[PDB]
């Protein structure tokens, strides 16, 4: 495996950080989170959602044809 100390070369970056006992674990959970999820949702709906409505449409049609075609059917046999 690989160990801290031998990963890669980094120069010039400062990282400032706080102790957990000094900060909140949920700061603006709703205030900032909700907006954030709305935003990630917008960013991906166009790629995720369409194939699924496409399946959805074929799902309802497909079963619809199945019922009307076979069972419900016995349409005309008139004499």
């Amino acid at each position: 495996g690989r160990q801290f100390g031998h990963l890669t070369r980094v120069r010039h970056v400062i990282t400032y950080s706080l102790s957990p006992f000094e900060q909140r674990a949920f700061p603006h959970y709703f205030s900032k989170g909700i907006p954030n999820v709305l935003r990630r949702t917008r960013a991906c709906i166009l790629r995720v959602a369409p194939p699924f409505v496409a399946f959805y449409l074929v799902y309802t049609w497909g079963t619809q044809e199945f019922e009307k075609s076979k069972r419900k059917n016995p349409a005309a046999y008139e004499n």
Binding site: Q3, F4, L7, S19, F21, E22
Partner: protein, 89 residues
Amino acid sequence: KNLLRNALVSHLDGTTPVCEDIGRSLLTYGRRIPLAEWESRIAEVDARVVREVCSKYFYDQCPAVAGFGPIEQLPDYNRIRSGMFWLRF
């Protein structure tokens, strides 16, 4: 304790260090605090005092960490923070 006694006395050797000590002691303590008083303070310290006094400032306390250089292997803060207490204690 002895190391502190030698350090105390080794330090106040010559006019400059003693002057600096008079000058700043008055700023801080308000008085001088003669060698002998320090000696009695030091004498009072035993294992218990070390354990209690250390516990107070060190035990399960959030440290301040500063690091400069090839510090990829410097432990994460949570990890440093967990080193400030002992699970067997």
